């Protein structure tokens, strides 16, 4: 859910691509911007960057297509943030691994009175590197 202002500043950014103000970004305008920044992408690399975002198929990027893509990237950023925050909470002592002791304290806080045997089984299911603890990458895997 983009706010009004978020949209307003994504419109500003879009405007810096849409040089002639017609409401679309062509391959050539994309390449004008990138050469501004000291880059020199080929036509085929430019066309692929257009095609990544062209929901139409019509050759160009209108502001709605651009915003659509920026909202997806916002929602992806915001998911990860929530997952990363969850992990930090679970990792009580903040050493970057959830221990069985830490998982049991958290599980009770969700209203699940777990024994060590059940908690250790959770560890085992999550533990891809075998170290007996849940790292951040193992947590993210379980949350997908």
């Amino acid at each position: 859910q983009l706010t009004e202002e978020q949209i307003a500043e994504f419109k500003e950014a879009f405007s810096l691509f849409d040089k002639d103000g017609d409401g679309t970004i062509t391959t050539k305008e994309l390449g004008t911007v990138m050469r501004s920044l000291g880059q020199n992408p080929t036509e085929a690399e430019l066309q692929d960057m257009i095609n990544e975002v062209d929901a139409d198929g019509n050759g160009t990027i209108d502001f709605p297509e651009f915003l659509t893509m920026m909202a997806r990237k916002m929602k992806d950023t915001d998911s990860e943030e929530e997952i990363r925050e969850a992990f930090r909470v679970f990792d009580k002592d903040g050493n970057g691994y959830i221990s069985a002791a830490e998982l049991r304290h958290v599980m009770t806080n969700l209203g699940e009175k777990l024994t060590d045997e059940e908690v250790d089984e959770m560890i085992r299911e999550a533990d891809i590197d075998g170290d007996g603890q849940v790292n951040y990458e193992e947590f993210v895997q379980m949350m997908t």
Binding site: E9, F10, A13, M49, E52, V53, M69, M70, K73, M74, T77
Partner: peptide, 10 residues
Amino acid sequence: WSKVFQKVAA
């Protein structure tokens, strides 16, 4: 594109 988003997020 993700470059553009991270500039605007910041």
